[PDB]
Every structure is written in structure tokens, then in C-alpha cells.
Design a binder for this molecule. Sequence first.
Ligand SMILES: CC(C)C[C@@H](N)C(=O)N1CCC[C@H]1C(=O)NCc1cccc(Cl)c1
Ligand code: NA
Ligand code: NA
Lengths: 9, 249, 27
Amino acid sequence: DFEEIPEEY
Amino acid sequence: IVEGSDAEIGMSPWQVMLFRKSPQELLCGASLISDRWVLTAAHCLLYPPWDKNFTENDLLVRIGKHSRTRYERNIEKISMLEKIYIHPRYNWRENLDRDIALMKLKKPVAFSDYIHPVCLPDRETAASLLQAGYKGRVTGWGNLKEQPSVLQVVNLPIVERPVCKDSTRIRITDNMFCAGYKPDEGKRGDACEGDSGGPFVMKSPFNNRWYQMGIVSWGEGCDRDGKYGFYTHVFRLKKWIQKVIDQFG
Amino acid sequence: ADCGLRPLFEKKSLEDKTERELLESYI
Ligand SMILES: CC(C)C[C@@H](N)C(=O)N1CCC[C@H]1C(=O)NCc1cccc(Cl)c1
Ligand code: NA
Ligand code: NA
């Protein structure tokens, strides 16, 4: 249910 | 948080989300205590009965959040861990005595309207405020019942040590305190699964600053009548906190 | 040295909706 976070992290 | 309310924006700017990298999920709450140190529950990182043992690289810290699941662009900041420090006498085998851990961040976080550290108590604030009936505040993204869209808040009174002790078969220590309403009080509320590691805070009426007196540690069930949530007593473990920070920056 | 003062509340002299509940319990 979690929105994807920026790849960078 | 059971029977709490939605947080106001910026109400708890020290609130930290411990986040699993894969599968991406909430692991725990936590709190910001400086631009490079985060405080949490040891059991968030190490709990062998449940085969939990995280390393630095397993995790991220998300600071400045409000929404649980949303990526809050231009507001939250996401940080990598440099090092985890667990209390050397953390008792995971029995009653989570000394349930406390520090996390050092790779890089300092920029403070903002939504990101700001909480204070840690000195002995005199602790003595003034840690009194039966005095209320603190607990915040978290954990279960609403034994999950929310946004950060939840609940205000709960500290309970007398005999009543804490008589509520449970677990051995309680001077490194813990319990909070919550009694059956006869009406009002209710508690921490629950996923609120682990989050802060119990109090606003000092002497200097009008927020202090973190406790860490969400353990309970039997959530919001059960006659049961109470148990919190790590932060002032009792401040010597260890200071040593760590002093020794590793 | 600025800990525990929230930018959107104490720094602005704005109070949140339930902090008075805590103060009233500090008897
Ligand atoms: C003493 C402990 C072995 C009891 C256990 N039910 C427990 O609370 N645990 C076992 C490992 C994690 C922790 C937990 O679930 N804490 C979450 C929680 C739930 C309700 C209230 C609070 Cl204050 C904290
Ligand atoms: Na007992
Ligand atoms: Na209860």
C-alpha cells in the first residue's frame, strides 16, 4: 500500500 | 494508535518513520533528537523471538511525514543509517527491559517547518513531570485496532506504579512506566502494533518545550480494559544515550 | 538548543488543539 519512493534512496 | 485523532500538520515534527527497504513497509516509529540522531525501541531492530535482526542497510528513516503511505514530495526527507546502537543490557528474552536504541544518520537532516527535534529530559523535568495522572502524548502510524491514512495522536495519563504492576503478570522494572486510562475513567486510547519505537512526549509548563519522556515499548493487546501501555523510561537511560552520542558523535 | 519548539506552534505562539489537556493534568 506504500507509494514507491525515489530510486535514489 | 487506538482511539486517537488525526495529527495536525507539524504537530509532531520530531516524528520518524522506520521504513523497510524491501518489501517497502512501515517497521516502527522513532523520534528525531538532533540533526543526525534518531531514537527508537531496541525491539524495532532486534527481537529474536520473531526472527527480527535488522542491519543499517535494511532500513531507511523518513522524517517530516504526515501521510502513512504517500510519498510526501517536497516535505518529507528520507535518510540512510550510518550505524545502529542497541542498549547493551536490552532484555529481549523477558520483559523488554532497557528497550532503547540510537540510529546515526549518514548525513544531517535539514530542519524545516515539518522537521524539528524534540528535547530529552534532564533530571529535574523528569522528576516534575513523571507523576501519576500527568498526561503525555503518543504518536504513530500503527494499527487503529487490536491502518490510518495519516499520523495519529493520543493523550494518555501516566499510571501509578502499583496499578501498572497489578495489571500484568510480566515483571516491570524502574526502566519502564505505564500510561492509559482506567476502566472507570471512561476515555480510552493506546499504542498498538507499528507504533513501537515512537515517542511519549510531554510539554513542560516551566519552559513550554516538548520533552520525550518515553518510548513506545510493549503492551498485552491494544486498548484492553484494565491493561496499560508500557514505555521505556528515557531519563533512566540518558547516561547511556549521552555516552553513545559523546563517543560516536 | 532549539529543541522541542515546533515551527508551526510554539515558534508562532499558536497552540495545537489538545495541548491544553496536557497542561491541565499538570496539577
Ligand atoms: C513484554 C513483551 C514480550 C509483550 C509483547 N506483547 C509486546 O508488547 N511486544 C513483543 C515484541 C514487540 C512488543 C510490542 O508488540 N509492542 C507494541 C505495543 C503494543 C501495545 C502497546 C504498546 Cl505501548 C506497544
Ligand atoms: Na503483577
Ligand atoms: Na487499557
